[PDB]
Structures are given as C-alpha cells and as structure tokens.
Amino acid sequence: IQRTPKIQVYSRHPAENGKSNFLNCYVSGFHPSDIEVDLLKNGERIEKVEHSDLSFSKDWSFYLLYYTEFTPTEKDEYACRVNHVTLSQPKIVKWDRDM
C-alpha cells in the first residue's frame, strides 16, 4: 500500500571548509508523493531551500532532490528532516562528509 522514503544527505562537490558548495537531501522510494522535507543548520530550518520537480522510478515510487547553497566549516552541523504519512514523527538524517 505505502512505501517509506529512503533519505540521503550529501554535498554536490567533496566538502572543503571555507569553500562554497551545495547541500543535498535526496528523498526516494516513497509512495504516496506528499512529503515534508527540511534542511537543518545546527538544528534549525534553513530558508531558501529549492527542490526538483516530483518524478518517479521504474517501480512507481517517488523521488525529489532538496538543495541549498552552503559553505561548510569544521564546527557547523547539517541535517535533513523528513516527514511522510508512513513515519510516526520526522526522520532526521545527519550530513556526514564520508557518505
């Protein structure tokens, strides 16, 4: 009936402190299409987050890319918060440079 989203958080280019980049939250494998996605900076919602147009894979499950321009630093924490009809509460996925 319903499918829970897979979540990946990562940067467009390999992370470099001080260097401008894009922070990405790829949500995929979910059904139905309504989803709530936020990018967080030190636990707070980032404003001006853009997203791709809703599409779907060969198995019919939906996918979207959420992204924002950012400049990483050693100290700053980034995460992606996602909510879907299949989730009891929002799911938080932390940005880890090695993934």
């Binding site: 009936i1 319903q2 499918r3 897979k6 990946q8 990562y10 467009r12 280019h13 390999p14 894009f22 990405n24 790829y26 995929s28 494998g29 059904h31 139905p32 299409s33 791709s52 147009d53 809703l54 599409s55 779907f56 060969k58 019919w60 499950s61 890319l65 992204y67 090695d98 993934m99």
Partner: protein, 276 residues
C-alpha cells in the same frame, strides 16, 4: 550510444481540495527537458536543457493541447477507478503512467514502453510486442477489453514507433553537446576502521552522466555482491550522479580488494584499490 525518451505522468486526487493535480515530466535519458503541470498556466523548460527553447509556438501549442486532453482523460480515469475498486469518493488516489522509446546509436527503435499504475501498483502495461496488454488484476482486464475493442495498442504503437522515435532523434541533434556526452565517473577509495580488526573500504564514483553505472568489489578476483553495501545512485544537482559501494574487510587484507567500475563514459572498465 543508446538513448531513451520518457514521460512520467502523475494524477493525484485530493477530495475537498480541488480537481486532481496532473503532472507530465519529460526526460531524454537522465535529463529532464519539460514539465507540464495542471497547477501552472504554461510549461516550464529546463535551463540544463536549453536545446528545447528552439522549438517555437507550433510545438508548444500542440503540446499544451495534448496535455489538457490528458488532464481530462486522467481525471475521468481516476473517477472510473473508484468504481473498478469499489472505493469511496473520500480518499486520495494516484494514477501514474510512464511511456516512451529506447533507440540505438542509429536512432532506430530498440523498445517502446507504456505502463500505468494505480496507487503504486501495476495496473496495465503495453507488452514489449507493442500489441498485447498485461492486466494486473480483474479491474485492469476491463480496461484491456475496452482497449482491444478500440484498437488502442495500434494508436500507442504508432506514437512509440513514429512521433517518439522522430522527436528523440531531433532532441538528440539539437542537444548534441550535452545529450550525446557521457561524463565518466571520478573515482577513489576511502578507508575507515570499524574496530581493531575490521575496516570499511568505500569505493566512490562522482560527476558521472548518465546515471547508469556498475560498482562492484572483488576479493582475490571474486565478486563480493552479497557482502557489498550499495547506496542508490543519487543526483548531484548539476546533471551528474554519485554512487558508492562499501565492503567490511579484515584489517590488514585491504590490498586483496579491488573496486571495479563500469560506465558509458569509460572506454574500458576501471580497477582501483585503497592507496594508503
């Protein structure tokens, strides 16, 4: 190389919230080039697909009219589906379809596609023969009988062998600088200890186009498929894709592992290892 054209169509009912929202997204391989949305007056073109801008009014007029016709059909098909599945008018439902063509280097048809789903499940599909239908259940058998009687497969095959093939060929010509260019992956292997006796070897592939790629790990020249963690290929946001494959190896045995990378952008498959 080989190419595809696909439209991904979604119609989602939302009772008490207006008519069902209808969206048709067009792609050439992994490049989105057009989007039609019932929530929008005119279509949107992709900046990464500037080659579509040279189409002119006749193309946009006819495509806008086909989309409007498709919005009405899909909204009607959504009402009929509730009857086919004995469903209430209260719930939200999704009708999806994906169709298009695959062509070889000579631009000749390799295969056509036209499948539909209701609520995430296969509903009806045009078989590879472009003549017969696979109905998933008894409700889709009613659609199947109605389409055999109306000879719909012939009309869809015509689009798939005709319009679909000829327009992809034209899109590939107009967008030759990008659509015809394969960007090879940039690769490297990272290493992270898990414990005092195991370490993760992660083989990375970045900046590649198209999305299609094979990342495998071998230990002593033997494929490690069962033990390899493989993430889903993901978009970078600049048209390119990224993917990694990771293996858990006994510490000190890293050099017995080799990552194998196959991608259209590469003249031959790459082999790489952890370089401490």
């Amino acid at each position: 190389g080989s190419h595809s054209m696909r439209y991904f169509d979604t119609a989602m009912s939302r009772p008490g919230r207006g008519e069902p929202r209808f969206i048709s997204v067009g792609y050439v391989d992994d490049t989105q080039f057009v989007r039609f949305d019932s929530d929008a007056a005119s279509p949107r073109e992709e900046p990464r697909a500037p080659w579509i801008e040279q189409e002119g009014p006749e193309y946009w007029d006819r495509n806008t009219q086909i989309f409007k016709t498709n919005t009405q059909t899909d909204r009607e098909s959504l009402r009929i589906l509730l009857r086919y599945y004995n469903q209430s008018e209260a719930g939200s439902h999704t009708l999806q379809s994906m169709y298009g063509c695959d062509v070889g280097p000579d631009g000749r048809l390799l295969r056509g596609h036209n499948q539909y789903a209701y609520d995430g499940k296969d509903y009806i599909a045009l078989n590879e023969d472009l003549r017969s239908w696979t109905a998933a259940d008894t409700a889709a058998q009613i659609t199947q009988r109605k389409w055999e009687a109306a000879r719909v497969a012939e009309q869809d095959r015509a689009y798939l062998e005709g319009t679909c093939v000829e327009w992809l060929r034209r899109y590939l010509e107009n967008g030759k600088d990008t659509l015809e260019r394969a960007d090879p992956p940039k690769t490297h292997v990272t290493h992270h200890p898990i414990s005092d006796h195991e370490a993760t070897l992660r083989c990375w592939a970045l900046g590649f186009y198209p999305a299609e790629i094979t990342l495998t790990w071998q230990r002593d020249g033997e494929d490690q498929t069962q033990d390899t963690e493989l993430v889903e290929t993901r978009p970078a946001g600049d048209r390119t894709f990224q993917k990694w494959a990771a293996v858990v190896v006994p510490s000190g045995e890293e050099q017995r592992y080799t990552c194998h990378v196959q991608h259209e952008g590469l003249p031959k498959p790459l082999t790489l290892r952890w370089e401490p």
